[PDB]
Amino acid sequence: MVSKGEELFGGIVPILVELEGDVNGHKFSVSGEGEGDATYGKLTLKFICTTGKLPVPWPTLVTTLVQCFSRYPDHMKQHDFFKSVMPEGYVQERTIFFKDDGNYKTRAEVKFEGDTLVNRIELKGIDFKEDGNILGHKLEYNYISHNVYITADKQKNGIKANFKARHNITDGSVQLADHYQQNTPIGDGPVILPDNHYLSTQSALSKDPNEKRDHMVLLEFVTAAGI
Incomplete structure (x- = not known):
């Protein structure tokens, strides 16, 4: 049994991302586009800050986006x-x-x-x-x-x-960002509760040399493991 869910990801899927942010009263908006290929765990995205200068560092948004x-x-x-x-x-x-x-x-x-x-x-x-x-x-x-x-x-x-x-x-030190996450279904369909495992996640950040807006290009690979 391969489910409807799984089947929707068998090929290359277009992705849209829209974020509205307020950090200490600094408002901003981000838009992202690209595509995902779950067969290889692969995302390729480009994000734009549509409100001008992003008021936080782009790497702090990666996990959210x-x-x-x-x-x-x-x-x-x-x-x-x-x-x-x-x-x-x-x-x-x-x-x-x-x-x-x-x-x-x-x-x-x-x-x-x-x-x-x-x-x-x-x-x-x-x-x-x-x-x-x-x-x-x-x-x-x-x-x-x-x-x-x-x-x-x-x-x-x-x-x-x-x-x-x-x-x-930038001084060689490290800024920890400790994440706590919860995911729940929108609809009322079947409940698939996993055994403990993890996602091995990597992302490469880059810039489009032709882009003048504040932006981030992202190449990401994620693989489930631990079982």
């Missing part, structure tokens, strides 16, 4: 919550705690609109230091790579995740 594109090994396909709820989708909520600084709280809906997988996000950041690493733009524009630890959340018919992102600071 579609885990339905992760590659689940065949022997782990019954543990893929993300595709099991498609096309109706899931709500994804996080709190992201920046060590010795503020926090993001995010709420997103991830679902199909026609053939296109959409991620609509609102982000609220509070308690940031004005000349801290985030509002002061002291984070390097590089890669990001860690494991995303997933566990079932039977009680809410969905899942939880936790992970630590460690952002390099």
Whole structure:
């Protein structure tokens, strides 16, 4: 049995991302486009800040800005919550705690609109230091790579995740971003609660040399593991 959910990701899927943000009263909007190929765990996206200069560093937004594109090994396909709820989708909520600084709280809906997988996000950041690493733009524009630890959340018919992102600071130090995540189904269909496992996640950040807007180009690979 391959499910409707799984079948929607058998080929290359167009992706749209729309984010509305407010961090310490700094409002901004981001739009993203590209495509995902779940067979290889592969995302290719370009994001634009449509309101001018982004007021936080681009690497702090990467995790917020579609885990339905992760590659689940065949022997782990019954543990893929993300595709099991498609096309109706899931709500994804996080709190992201920046060590010795503020926090993001995010709420997103991830679902199909026609053939296109959409991620609509609102982000609220509070308690940031004005000349801290985030509002002061002291984070390097590089890669990001860690494991995303997933566990079932039977009680809410969905899942939880936790992970630590460690952002390099321009002085050589590290800015920890401690993530707490919950995902729940939008619709009322079958409940696929996974065994404990993780997503091995990597992303390469780059710039389009022809682009004059504040922007980020992202190449991402994610593979499920641990079982």
